[PDB]
Write a protein that binds this ligand. Structure first.
Ligand SMILES: [Cl-]
Ligand SMILES: [Zn+2]
Ligand SMILES: [Zn+2]
Ligand SMILES: [Zn+2]
Ligand SMILES: [Zn+2]
Length: 471
């Protein structure tokens, strides 16, 4: 991909001029953001930037943009609404319910192909040639929005990268697009640094054997999910398994990298998984070593842990420096990682007996066996554990926490399937229209909410829609 970076920044300037019209008049800025790391960092960037301009703001951290949400926002008396890290897939609904309000969309998902009214400004790098999952995240769009508003907001560069890491925008091992420009801004201020290290969770707070056993993207053969074998392997290679990765010297890290690469080669791992095991890791000298805020992936996991318990507002406070909010949030990470471990064990046990395999898709309905906010991780795990054909997309459904008759689904696939022509966001958007649902997202990763009554109909429908995308 090749962005028109200046054309995108010109659009950012247009949105900044609009929001300053309302700041001048003392209008309270209504902010709607997503509950994962990309949305939480986005909300904190807006909260800090708008605080620097003396503006007032009201933040709501939500699970998605829905028609039910927009009907609630229609009755709110705010003059301007800012959607961050979401909203691109709901332009028609935003046009309908917020017609007489000013709306700013700071997002990176493929936008719905509809025209907007003059007071609804879409700020999306995809419209300027960006790859939606590599070149910039929602926190990155919000960062450049904040930077154009005030140059001092460059000190939010690390927070913006935390959201990009939460969105796995360095999933192939390196950063791309305007994420590299954010990194340069943070390096100029000395608030972040890019290392070439093991790209796994647990650099700061986990012992080495849990860092290896937790690895699911990519998995480490025979070691993933088995802390006892991880301990044996580390000791056999001359490492203290209880030591943390940050406590290793640079010489020991390189020795660990060599052993892991040899291990994956000996067990037949693919080249793409080997090449992304070691790569860009962003750390921040603003925080001490051993603190999860010191590394972007641990920081993002910490924020996701707060949003998992409907406490994303606590995660926003952590980004803004609330140390008491940090002390609470730190106690939420362990149960978050444990639930992912149990989710993988449930997948390995029940995939064969429960999965619905069509000609172009896997559809797995877990009921409540996996939390609805974890179906995206579950779908990726099925691919990364070898349960699913890499060229066949995986959709995992779970009952929503709020409505047992409503399902939340996440679709995930690989680059090999994208080469076949599959586009999960486009397919889910079309299928949702036919079963009274709401769906959309990236070509490689998308989500959908449908009534539980429509599950059997949806499986036949999405299999047909995906099959027609095949080039
Ligand atoms: Cl999703
Ligand atoms: Zn160019
Ligand atoms: Zn997303
Ligand atoms: Zn995002
Ligand atoms: Zn690149």
């Amino acid at each position: 991909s090749h962005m028109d970076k200046e054309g995108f920044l010109n659009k950012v300037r247009e949105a900044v001029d609009v929001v300053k019209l309302h700041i001048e008049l003392g209008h309270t800025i209504r902010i709607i953001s997503h509950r994962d790391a990309d949305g939480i960092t986005s909300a904190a960037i807006l909260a800090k930037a708008l605080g620097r301009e003396g503006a007032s703001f009201h933040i709501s951290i939500v699970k998605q943009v829905s028609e039910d949400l927009l009907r609630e926002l229609k009755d709110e008396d705010y003059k301007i609404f800012i959607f961050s890290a979401l909203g691109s897939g709901s332009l028609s609904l935003i046009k309908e319910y917020l017609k007489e309000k000013t709306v700013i969309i700071l997002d990176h998902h493929p936008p719905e192909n509809v025209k907007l009214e003059e007071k609804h400004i879409l700020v999306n790098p995809v419209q300027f040639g960006a790859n939606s999952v590599r070149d910039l995240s929602g926190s990155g769009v919000t960062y450049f929005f904040a930077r154009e508003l005030n140059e001092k907001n460059r000190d939010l560069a690390y927070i913006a990268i935390v959201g990009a890491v939460g969105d796995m925008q360095e999933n192939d091992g390196v950063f791309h697009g305007m994420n590299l420009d954010i990194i340069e801004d943070g390096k100029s201020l000395g608030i972040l640094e890019v290392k070439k290290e093991l790209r796994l969770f647990g650099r700061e707070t986990r012992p080495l054997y849990q860092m290896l056993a937790y690895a699911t993207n990519p998995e480490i053969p025979e070691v993933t999910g088995d802390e006892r074998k991880a301990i044996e392997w580390l000791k056999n290679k001359g490492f203290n398994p209880e030591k943390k990765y940050w406590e290793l010297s640079e010489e020991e890290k390189k020795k660990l990298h060599d052993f892991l690469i040899i291990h994956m080669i000996k067990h037949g791992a693919g080249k793409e998984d080997i090449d992304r095991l070691i790569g860009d890791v962003v750390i921040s000298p603003l925080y001490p070593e051993g603190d999860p805020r010191h590394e972007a992936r641990e920081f993002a996991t910490l924020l996701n842990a707060t949003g998992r318990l409907n406490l994303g507002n606590l995660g926003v406070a952590v980004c803004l420096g609330d140390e008491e909010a940090f002390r609470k949030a730190l106690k939420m990470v362990e149960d978050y990682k444990r639930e992912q471990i149990e989710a993988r064990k449930w997948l390995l046990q029940n995939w064969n007996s429960e999965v619905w395999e069509g000609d172009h898709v896997y559809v797995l309905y877990v009921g409540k066996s996996i939390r609805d906010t974890l179906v995206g991780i579950a779908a990726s795990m099925a691919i990364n554990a070898g349960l699913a054909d890499p060229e066949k997309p995986v959709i995992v459904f779970a009952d929503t926490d709020e409505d047992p008759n409503l399902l939340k689904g996440s679709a995930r696939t690989t680059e090999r399937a994208l080469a076949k022509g599959y586009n999960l966001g486009e397919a889910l958007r079309k299928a949702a229209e036919l079963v009274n649902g709401e769906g959309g997202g990236h070509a490689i990763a998308a989500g959908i909410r449908i009534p539980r009554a429509r599950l059997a109909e949806f499986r036949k429908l999405i299999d047909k829609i995906l099959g027609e995308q095949v080039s």
